[PDB]
Amino acid sequence: EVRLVESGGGLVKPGGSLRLSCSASGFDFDNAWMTWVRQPPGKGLEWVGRITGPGEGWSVDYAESVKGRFTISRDNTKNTLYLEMNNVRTEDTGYYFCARTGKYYDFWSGYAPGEEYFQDWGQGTLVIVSSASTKGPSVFPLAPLGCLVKDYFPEPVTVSWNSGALTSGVHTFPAVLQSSGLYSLSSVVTVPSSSLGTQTYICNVNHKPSNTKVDKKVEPK
Amino acid sequence: ELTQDPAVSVALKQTVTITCRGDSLRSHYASWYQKKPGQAPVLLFYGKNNRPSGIPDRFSGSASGNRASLTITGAQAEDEADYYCSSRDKSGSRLSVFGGGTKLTVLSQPKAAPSVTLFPPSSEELQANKATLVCLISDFYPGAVTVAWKADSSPVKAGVETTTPSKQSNNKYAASSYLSLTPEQWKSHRSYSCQVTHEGSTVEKTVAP
């Protein structure tokens, strides 16, 4: 019944600007504390910032890594929370989550410092800060067998063998993201050793973002 | 500021404790979150003995000194995930921080050694003044491998890109490692080898011009 939905993510070049939004329903959003959290792919969660409610004057706190570049604001009339990202860097890449933030404190006893906990989350929106340009793969045969799909941006590519006839023993490995910012992947099929001469094995590579379609025949050296 | 062990493994239905340590924990409570790929984090526990409704009873937390601990009593396969502690970054501060995170592996399959296939540079690639060796690793469990590249039994410390393991359909894991080389280096050495170490056992494949 509590719903949070982030949007606005996408591809942005370093130094660009971006506005994320998080819409909310099912709870008293107007008075709720709201927190932004991000996660770089493969890395840990990082607290971005939080906007308070009326009791704290709608004040905002930021992580030092984003202070002076990010601004968090809210539009209570629209039940929408915003994260404005300016002068973004590659380190800002990641999934961005908005979280309804609870407060664990006892006003009347004062026995402990108040704790903020994140009880409801949206599904997240992906932001990629990359200077990489659209790039078609170089397709190289891997002789006895498979295909090497090298140096492409962005994801995805599609690989099929013998125009979809060969689906048995085909293992298309997940792509690797290199330090260059470009992807590479390999697709390999296990075939009978005797059938090498009899059957011609061709792999079909499609990279729609670059309008690249390559059919590479794989055969022994 | 908040430090946890990066990796721990538990057997099915066994007990595992994931611990968070930091100076702030001497005076502040910690909250605990479960994070799986492609899914939002989930609050598991916070404060002094608070578990949100809908969180199974096998999750419980504790705290003493400068540490906070999340205990899973009877881990299930669905409990395999990253777990993060969260607290104030320091006393007198309005900022929160997450711990480094702990990847909990729940051993849900028999141990399986990886199958390794190593491919030499293509003739077409070499004619383009480029050379890459492809080391394909599949059918291993659990999903953690260390890949080492050797140039005639000498370790190569450049031009290596390796994927994190990803689950296959048969619940084993696959990974790949790529070594980038100029054509000169590929012919300057007699052989090149991919060394895959899994659960203390090393699997080596070798190619040559």
Side-chain angles (χ1 to χ4, degrees), chain A residues 1-192 194-197 199-221, chain B residues 1-156 158-189 191-209:
Chain A
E1 257 142 38
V2 169
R3 303 177 181 279
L4 297 157
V5 173
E6 304 95 340
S7 61
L11 203 35
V12 57
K13 309 271 163 263
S17 283
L18 193 66
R19 179 177 92 190
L20 310 183
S21 82
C22 161
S23 48
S25 65
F27 64 104
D28 182 10
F29 171 86
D30 290 359
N31 300 308
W33 290 23
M34 299 298 290
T35 300
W36 284 100
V37 176
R38 72 189 180 183
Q39 174 181 60
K43 297 343 269 193
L45 298 171
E46 181 176 11
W47 189 83
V48 176
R50 175 259 301 115
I51 175 148
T52 62
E56 301 281 339
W58 314 101
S59 69
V60 189
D61 297 283
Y62 299 92
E64 303 292 298
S65 54
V66 308
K67 198 182 172 53
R69 299 187 303 121
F70 290 12
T71 62
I72 293 160
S73 58
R74 62 197 308 156
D75 186 342
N76 287 352
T77 305
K78 278 177 167 38
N79 259 49
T80 306
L81 171 85
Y82 299 105
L83 172 70
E84 285 168 282
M85 294 138 93
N86 293 298
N87 295 134
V88 305
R89 332 168 154 140
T90 50
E91 298 91 2
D92 298 319
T93 292
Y95 285 93
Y96 282 67
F97 305 92
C98 65
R100 164 193 190 201
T101 304
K103 302 175 253 43
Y104 182 69
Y105 77 110
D106 189 37
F107 171 82
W108 288 279
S109 76
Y111 191 57
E115 174 191 23
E116 308 178 43
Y117 58 98
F118 316 116
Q119 58 183 128
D120 296 288
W121 304 70
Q123 76 296 333
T125 187
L126 177 57
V127 180
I128 292 138
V129 185
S130 167
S131 71
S133 282
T134 301
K135 186 163 178 317
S138 311
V139 177
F140 300 119
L142 300 165
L145 65 79
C147 269
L148 169 64
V149 183
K150 188 181 176 12
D151 290 342
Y152 67 91
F153 186 87
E155 286 245 77
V157 303
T158 71
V159 182
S160 62
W161 284 89
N162 284 14
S163 306
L166 184 50
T167 52
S168 180
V170 167
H171 193 1
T172 65
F173 282 71
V176 63
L177 185 41
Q178 322 176 252
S179 58
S180 58
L182 300 180
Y183 299 90
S184 297
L185 71 75
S186 299
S187 168
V188 62
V189 63
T190 59
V191 296
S194 303
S195 192
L196 283 187
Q199 181 37 301
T200 50
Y201 296 104
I202 82 161
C203 92
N204 330 116
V205 178
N206 223 285
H207 187 242
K208 288 173 180 178
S210 69
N211 300 318
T212 305
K213 170 206 181 23
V214 163
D215 304 9
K216 220 78 199 273
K217 193 198 66 169
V218 193
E219 259 200 354
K221 311 224 151 175
Chain B
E1 191 82 29
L2 285 187
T3 60
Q4 341 167 22
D5 265 347
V8 70
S9 37
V10 63
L12 278 163
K13 299 275 166 13
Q14 294 316 278
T15 310
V16 60
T17 289
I18 290 170
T19 290
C20 184
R21 279 192 188 77
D23 282 318
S24 299
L25 303 186
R26 269 185 247 278
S27 325
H28 298 83
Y29 294 112
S31 58
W32 285 98
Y33 302 90
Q34 179 188 76
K35 177 71 171 69
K36 307 195 200 193
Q39 333 197 9
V42 184
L43 174 64
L44 304 167
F45 211 84
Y46 64 95
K48 175 187 87 221
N49 199 236
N50 290 93
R51 178 197 305 120
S53 56
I55 299 304
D57 298 333
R58 60 179 185 276
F59 294 90
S60 74
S62 62
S64 69
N66 76 326
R67 56 152 217 80
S69 292
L70 175 84
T71 295
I72 307 178
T73 300
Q76 318 267 322
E78 43 245 47
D79 298 337
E80 181 167 271
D82 300 306
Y83 291 84
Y84 297 85
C85 57
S86 182
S87 200
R88 214 81 73 54
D89 73 312
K90 55 168 144 102
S91 305
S93 155
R94 271 160 199 249
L95 319 184
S96 299
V97 287
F98 292 98
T102 295
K103 181 209 186 47
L104 174 69
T105 292
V106 175
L107 296 176
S108 63
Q109 303 287 339
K111 169 158 118 173
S115 300
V116 185
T117 295
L118 176 56
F119 282 105
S122 214
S123 64
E124 330 204 346
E125 187 182 22
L126 291 157
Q127 294 197 237
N129 205 219
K130 288 309 198 303
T132 55
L133 310 114
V134 183
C135 187
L136 300 174
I137 321 174
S138 62
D139 273 348
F140 58 94
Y141 190 87
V145 291
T146 281
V147 179
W149 288 89
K150 301 279 190 103
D152 275 337
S153 285
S154 316
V156 169
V160 50
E161 307 274 22
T162 302
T163 61
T164 69
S166 92
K167 216 176 293 322
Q168 305 180 168
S169 71
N170 63 354
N171 298 287
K172 306 203 209 155
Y173 289 80
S176 46
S177 187
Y178 297 82
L179 179 59
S180 279
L181 279 182
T182 78
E184 295 80 75
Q185 316 158 295
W186 167 237
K187 316 156 151 155
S188 167
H189 298 91
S191 67
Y192 269 93
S193 311
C194 180
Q195 270 170 359
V196 187
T197 54
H198 171 80
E199 293 285 338
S201 325
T202 85
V203 176
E204 172 224 89
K205 294 317 189 83
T206 286
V207 286

